[PDB]
RNA sequence: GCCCUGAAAAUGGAUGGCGCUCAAGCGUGUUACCUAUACUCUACCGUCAGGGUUGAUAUGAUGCCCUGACGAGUAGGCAGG
RNA sequence: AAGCUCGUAUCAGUUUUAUGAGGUAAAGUUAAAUAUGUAAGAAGUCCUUGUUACUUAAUUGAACGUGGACAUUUGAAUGAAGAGCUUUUAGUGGGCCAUUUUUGGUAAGC
RNA sequence: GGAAUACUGCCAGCUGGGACUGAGGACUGCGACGUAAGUCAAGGAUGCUGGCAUAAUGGUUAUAUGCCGCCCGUCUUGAAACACGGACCAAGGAGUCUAACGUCUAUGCGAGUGUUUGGGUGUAAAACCCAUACGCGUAAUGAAAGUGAACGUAGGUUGGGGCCUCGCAAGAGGUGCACAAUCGACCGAUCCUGAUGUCUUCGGAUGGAUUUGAGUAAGAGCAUAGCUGUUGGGACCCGAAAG
RNA sequence: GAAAUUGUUGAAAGGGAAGGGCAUUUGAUCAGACA
């Protein structure tokens, strides 16, 4: 809406808002980018740090399927159970039955260990795992079984 | 709403200083003064008649 | 509509108006007003004229009798402020002048009654008058300003 | 100072306050009656002008 | 003319009554303007300007930090108070009974706390069950968790993590964020 | 109800008392100036009667008053003006004299003019255009309840208890001197004297420390 | 100390002009008086701050009232029309 | 401009007391005037008995603590349209004059 | 030996004349005066009289008179300038749209959020309904191979709105969200140590460190809308010599 | 069928410009109001 705009304000005064000495002309700084290394480094240091440089190895041909692990904290990893069924899990918590929590249905590539699940024993299917993350499952009276 | 000066009006200077009637009834700015018999020492005035 | 309409309108009540502090309190004139005192009239029908104070009266104007025999000016109020005292008095002690008030002079030829009262005074004042000499000429002629008088310096 | 103005208070303390504990800045300076008794006031007056060259 | 030490005509710079136009908001500024005039208490003049607060500074307070302080000692029985909306956290198993009060709650968090033998409230009911603040706990989430706030500042030394769009390499970490190229910071 | 009845001769009885006691605190007050300034000649004159000399006790008050524009004034009495809260020409307040506050005036004397009241100007400048500062709000006196609902904590329960703990430099002369707004006065009634103010007294200006003759000036803005 | 001399520049010519000599000049003193949008008091407009007031049975809760203080402004910014 | 946490309160183009630093004017090594740093309390003081891997010849220090005690003349004057805190962005980045000092220049509306 | 005037200053001393203002609109208050009833100059003006009902007052406009008043816009330290533009009139005429974002505000839901590439449907470019994914967010850190967040009531200390207890209150005590300071614990990277163990050089337990990170430490983001700001675009409008 | 601009009539004005502000007199006009 124009009808909101401040140069529906400025109607009647001469410069429009942009001053009388410096004027406002097409491009005083450059276009862009230009100058970051000559006359805008102050900017680009404090606001771009790093900016300039190589850092490490290229990578031909990068794809992210290769590189698609999810993570799912012990934090969670009760709520894929379905909230109806869940409740009956944790009371009654016994082992020749425990829940079987398949992370990859429902897209996690790795269970890390962020903290505390409950007493309940579980079974957890996992690609990948951490040091911490078992300990506390295993602790908790349940295993990580690895799939593929 | 509206501020009466005391000095003048006299009912707004007899609602502060409940002391204004009686100051007047016994006048007390004109009270009169003991009379006193000193007078200046011949030192004092040997001073002031000094060249 | 051609005017849609103010969502709240101001009532119609009128408020009384809050107590006031004034009382009427009677006039006190300046000391040149004596019962009894020549007067210079100084505006109106009679300007001019010299005539006598009589009886201060309760619409606070003053009662003033010429009197009629002498300049021709009736019983008439006058106002105290209109008017230069003089330094000269006839006694007026001889005068009734009870029967006054303002209700008397009420507008609501000459009725009789105030034919009547006009040359009744005049017995008492008429007498009184000739005694000092020229005081029946001069309560009959009119005051001036001349060339030369300066009304701050002449006395009255 | 700090521990003469615990003194002063603490001694106070049974001195029923009225302790004044405060720093105050010179004040002026109260009655006095000179005595010109074997001290008569010299009259003094300005002097002429010299060259002393 | 008149020396003036400070700046004339100068606002204070608070909200007198909330930016937002919506009608039922606006029925709690009325009547928590009149309990914060005649009820003498300060609860109901600290619920009044904080039904003022904007957006960002209304952070939500997720049903796990009312479990802290219910916990915390003697506040078990307390009716905590959220001006803000309460979100649920499922990361706690457990959850009191209590009572909670707020503007606006998730589904979740309705489900929790009526789950307990809890009960949820309005504001409003809260002014007529306690309108001088008898027992209650006025509870804050955390204004300084934001996003935008992790860049507030930016400049040398001071670890602020500048705006940018993408994250990774060769994405301003080379000149100037290592001693190897160039200098550090 | 009993309310406007049985609560109004109950109050209207305490009213009674607080100018039954402003009555005799009030009396106490003008007995004991006079005897001060009688003992004050009584002292002069036993002195001279001894051949000796009587030193008056300084000044201990000076009523400072701001005789110059609001501009083109030097940064450091600038900022001290505003401390005495000089804010505008012709305006002024009571100071106490101590070595503290005698080095100020003597920052500002190009911008002021001072001397020592006498209870005369005291008296007029209060009642006649003391106000008081109440949440701000500069209130007018006019009555004893301003004065007893802000310095009651203190005693100064009327407007002679102001005038007394002004005059007499008391041990709560900040409270009150800063309980009255800063008097706000009108240029001098007769005119300044002399053709130009910005000499010092001394040379036939208007300000500077002028003494005793800052009671005639004063009365002229009042 | 005052005055004169030293002291000569170009269209006609400027203590501002007229004109002024026990001054209407010069040095100094006492007073009276004139008048700015500044000062004091009052009314009104707006701005800011501090408070009062939600009870039907009316018409505004961006409302009504109370109290004070304050008001220059280019480039510039904002709020309300 | 938007506000935010708060509200008796830390402040201040100011003095005073206390205490440092200076090497211009004058003086002929000495040393001003004006400006300048700090302090004037609760984040305080006194006692009492805890911690440590540092320190000690050492139950001795250092740093931080527990328990107890001293509140508004609480530690000088005056003042304070409140104290702090943050975000965000406009214009500007040709200056000129007067005073008190001063260099270049013979001087200058330099 | 007495005085009086003068001068200075004070009185909650007396009285007279002139000018200006009349805000507010039931009562409330504080006083004063009265034995009393009441009255009063005491939280802002009333009473009495007169005239014209008129263009008298008042407005509007031309003239005249007194004093004042330089020509506008612009650049500029400085323009009335012997600086630039403008004879006059009417009509057109200049910070817009968009793609990608920062802060701020409102709204819906909220550890999530986004129906509109598409399909169903329809009164037919609307509205209505919806499966799969996908994007941001919930995890950081190293160039990388890689690894990946509780010693403890998610810790301690100083201060903190608010609430609770006592007390007549003043204030002290209990608890203390957000938030600011500060010391720790946790994950990653770099340097150091190097365990029970082993395909005898793999494995990396443990323990460190004036080190380092855009981290954890009971989630706050996603979507749309608006103001302001930026970048690219003809980019607020008009204008080159050229290629 | 606007404005620049023009002809006619009427009114007023005019000593090297014209035009403006404050103030009131004079001329022309205007309601409102009262009653």
Not at chain 1, 23 to 47: C, E, F, L, T, V
Not at chain 5, 4 to 21: I, Y
Not at chain 5, 171 to 180: I, K, L
Not at chain 6, 144 to 172: C, Q, R, W
């Amino acid at each position: 809406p124009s009808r909101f705009t401040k140069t529906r304000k400025h109607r009647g005064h001469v410069s429009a808002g942009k001053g009388r000495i410096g004027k406002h002309r097409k491009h005083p700084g450059g276009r862009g980018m230009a100058g970051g290394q000559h006359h805008h480094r102050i900017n680009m240091d404090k606001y771009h740090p790093g900016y300039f440089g190589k850092v490490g190895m290229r990578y031909f041909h990068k794809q992210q399927a290769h590189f698609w692990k999810p993570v799912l904290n012990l934090d969670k990893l009760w709520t894929l159970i379905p909230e109806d069924k869940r409740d009956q899990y944790l009371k009654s918590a016994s082992k020749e039955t425990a829940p079987v929590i398949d992370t990859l249905a429902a897209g996690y590539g790795k269970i890390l260990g962020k903290g505390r699940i409950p007493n309940v024993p579980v079974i957890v299917k996992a690609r990948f795992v951490s040091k911490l993350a078992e300990e506390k499952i295993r602790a908790a009276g349940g295993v990580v079984e690895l799939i593929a | 709403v509206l501020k009466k000066n005391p000095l003048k009006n006299k009912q707004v200077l007899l609602r502060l200083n409940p002391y204004a009637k009686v100051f007047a009834a016994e006048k007390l700015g004109s009270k009169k003064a003991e009379k006193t018999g000193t007078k200046p020492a011949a030192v004092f005035t040997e001073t002031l008649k000094h060249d | 509509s051609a005017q849609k309409a103010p969502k709240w309108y101001p009532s119609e009540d009128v408020a009384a108006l809050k107590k006031t502090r004034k009382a009427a309190r009677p006039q006190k004139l300046r000391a040149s007003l004596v019962p009894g005192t020549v007067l210079i009239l100084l505006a109106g029908r009679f300007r001019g004229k010299r005539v006598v104070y009589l009886k201060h009266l309760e619409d606070n104007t003053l009662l003033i009798s010429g009197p009629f025999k002498v300049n021709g000016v009736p019983l008439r109020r006058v106002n105290a402020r209109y008017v230069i005292a003089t330094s000269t008095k006839v006694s007026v002690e001889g005068v009734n002048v009870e029967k006054f008030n303002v209700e008397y002079f009420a507008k609501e030829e000459i009725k009789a009654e105030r034919v009547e009262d006009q040359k009744v005074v005049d017995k008492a004042l008429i007498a009184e008058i000739k005694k000092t000499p020229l005081l029946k000429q001069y309560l009959s002629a009119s005051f001036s300003l001349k060339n030369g008088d300066k009304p701050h310096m002449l006395k009255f | 100072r700090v521990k003469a103005n615990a003194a002063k208070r603490a001694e106070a303390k049974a001195q029923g306050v009225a302790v004044q504990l405060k720093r105050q800045p010179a004040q002026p300076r109260e009655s006095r009656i000179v005595s010109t008794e074997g001290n008569v006031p010299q009259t003094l007056a300005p002097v002429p002008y010299e060259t002393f060259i | 003319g008149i020396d003036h030490t400070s700046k004339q005509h100068k606002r204070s710079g608070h909200r007198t009554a909330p930016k937002s136009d919506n009608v039922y908001l606006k029925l709690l500024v009325k009547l928590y303007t009149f309990l914060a005039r005649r009820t003498d208490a300060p609860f109901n003049k600290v619920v009044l300007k904080a039904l003022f607060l904007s957006k960002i500074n209304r952070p939500p307070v997720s049903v796990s930090r009312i479990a802290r302080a219910l916990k915390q000692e003697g506040a078990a029985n307390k009716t905590v108070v959220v001006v803000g909306t309460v979100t649920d956290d499922a990361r706690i198993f457990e959850f009191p009974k209590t009572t909670v009060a707020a503007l606006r709650f998730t589904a979740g968090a309705r489900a929790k706390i009526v789950k307990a033998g809890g009960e949820c409230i309005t504001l409003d009911q809260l002014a007529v069950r306690a309108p001088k603040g008898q027992n209650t706990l006025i509870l804050r989430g955390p204004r300084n968790s934001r996003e935008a706030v992790r860049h507030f500042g930016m400049g040398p030394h001071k670890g602020k993590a500048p705006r940018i769009l993408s994250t990774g390499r060769k994405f301003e970490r080379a000149r100037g964020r290592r001693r190897s190229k160039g200098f550090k910071v | 109800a009993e309310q406007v009845a049985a609560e109004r001769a109950a109050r209207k009885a305490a009213n009674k008392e607080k100018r039954a006691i402003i009555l005799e605190r009030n009396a106490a007050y003008q007995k004991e100036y006079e005897t001060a300034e009688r003992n004050i000649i009584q002292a002069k004159r036993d002195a001279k009667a001894a051949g000796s000399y009587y030193v008056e006790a300084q000044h201990k008050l000076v009523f400072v008053v701001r005789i110059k524009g609001i501009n083109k004034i030097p940064p450091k009495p600038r900022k001290v003006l505003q401390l005495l809260r000089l804010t505008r020409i012709n305006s002024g307040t009571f100071v106490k004299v101590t070595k503290a506050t005698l080095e100020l005036l003597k920052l500002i004397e190009p911008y002021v003019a001072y001397g020592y009241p006498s209870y005369s100007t005291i008296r007029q400048l209060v009642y006649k255009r003391g106000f008081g500062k109440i949440n701000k709000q500069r209130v007018p006196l006019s009555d004893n309840a301003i004065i007893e609902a802000n310095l009651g904590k203190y005693g100064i329960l009327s407007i002679d208890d102001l005038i007394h703990e002004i005059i007499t430099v008391g041990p709560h002369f900040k409270q009150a001197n800063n309980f009255l707004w800063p008097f706000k006065l009108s240029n001098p009634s007769g005119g300044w004297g002399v053709p130009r103010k910005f000499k010092h007294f001394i040379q036939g200006g208007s300000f500077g420390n002028r003494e005793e003759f800052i009671n005639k000036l004063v009365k002229s803005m009042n």
